Design a protein around this ligand. Sequence first.
Ligand code: RN8
Ligand code: GLU
Ligand code: GLU
Ligand code: ZN
Ligand code: ZN
Lengths: 258, 258
Amino acid sequence: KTVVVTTILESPYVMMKKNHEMLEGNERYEGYCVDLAAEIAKHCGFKYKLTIVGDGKYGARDADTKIWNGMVGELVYGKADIAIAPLTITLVREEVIDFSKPFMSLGISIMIKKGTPIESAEDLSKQTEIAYGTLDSGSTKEFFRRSKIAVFDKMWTYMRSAEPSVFVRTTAEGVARVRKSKGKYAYLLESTMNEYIEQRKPCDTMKVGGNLDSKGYGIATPKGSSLGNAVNLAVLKLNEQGLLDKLKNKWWYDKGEC
Amino acid sequence: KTVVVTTILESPYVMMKKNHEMLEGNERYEGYCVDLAAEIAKHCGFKYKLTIVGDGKYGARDADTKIWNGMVGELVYGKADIAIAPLTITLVREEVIDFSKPFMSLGISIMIKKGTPIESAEDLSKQTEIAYGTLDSGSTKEFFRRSKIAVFDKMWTYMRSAEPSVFVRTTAEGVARVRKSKGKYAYLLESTMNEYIEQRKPCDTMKVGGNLDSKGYGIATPKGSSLGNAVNLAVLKLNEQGLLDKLKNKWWYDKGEC
Ligand SMILES: CCc1sc(C(=O)O)c(-c2ccc(-c3c(C(=O)O)sc(CC)c3C#N)cc2)c1C#N
Ligand SMILES: N[C@@H](CCC(=O)O)C(=O)O
Ligand SMILES: N[C@@H](CCC(=O)O)C(=O)O
Ligand SMILES: [Zn+2]
Ligand SMILES: [Zn+2]
């Protein structure tokens, strides 16, 4: 059967083509994950349909309802067959879905408006003037919620209680907030997205300091799926054949505007 | 059943303690993988015995007999239950053993004696004054053997035919060759090992250039091992608790002496 792929509109992973209204099906979209999906499909020998996740979220479990939302929910509830997206491999997710070996490494990082007097997480934690926050429903928020590290625990205590809310619905919303806030908001997001935006006009943001953690994005499938083995082997093959490095360069740096 | 762990004497992952002569069993050893094994053993609820791989190799398949050597062989032939080592996750290996999600990232890199006029793989490939090689029976050799990237293809043509042989039996041999060759030998090895050595007396080596690729080390088990699921889940747990980061700091830069 045609494989339903869940993914997310997150630049430069998946983006609407300029002329998408004139195009159909998989041809409407472009990006790193669009190129990657085509290759995974070709190597595993399946036909597929790209679908954008309905609720626009990565995936988290409701503490009260126990229901998973986002791409993770679409796999868990059988709405999609595979997720090919910047979907972070985490323990709580690996308990309900399967991940390939990672196709990209990343860590949480700090985005500032250029000139913001912050160099580190410690810096953010030791001051009050500059607000800071995360994507409201992903792995970055969870990192802080769970961290027993002093600096990060202090940051979480501030973020969970800050008013108005320092959390954002989408990555684009976080980036826009840094850009419009005259240095008074810094955004905590994955190094991959941080480094992409740093190379986009109007070239007014910067990644500062080291990454806070180390993790990976993986291709996810419902637990027990017949696709998992082949998908994993394809990721390894594509890495070893240099495709992943090629795709990174194509979408990050070949298209740099700064 | 006490779990037989295969591993390899490779700094700073597994090393004999200074006073190892007076110690028995697992107590003889220390290092990142020693600490990791103890942590994994704790979470998965098993007792274990650390055993150094008999042939001192990571693992490769003989093209003629198709027999695997090294730690990979120990798993394949049922001589060990798990490998907890700086064992590179590769397609050919994944076809015969199982790997956890990676516990560490690395890439191939260049070690020179300080002052060697080499900045990149491209620099190495464009001269013959300075010899260069890799470890036998590991993933770095295979990388060059298979590469279609012009620079790396050219380097392999040289390496495979070079006389006397540029290949070494152990990392320690490669490092010693760099240190004694007065700038006329450069060694190709994983960034992790390169960066450790750079921070050790006599402080006469350097990592130069970027990494040539991006991959990871995983904990390996025989295909269909019951330990596989649990060990994978343990690695992710350790990562998120910051324990892996803690271990990396403990063994690389807390032990820095340069
Ligand atoms: C326990 C969770 C952690 S920790 C950690 C780390 O960097 O320490 C990583 C990590 C992420 C990615 C790579 C990697 C590749 C790339 O860096 O692009 S490529 C490729 C083969 C396909 C990779 C593997 N294996 C390696 C390690 C990780 C995960 N997942
Ligand atoms: N990649 C993250 C989303 C981005 C973030 O949390 O910063 C996830 O899978 O949840
Ligand atoms: N980590 C490598 C060994 C070292 C190397 O090849 O540079 C392996 O698993 O084969
Ligand atoms: Zn523990
Ligand atoms: Zn032979």
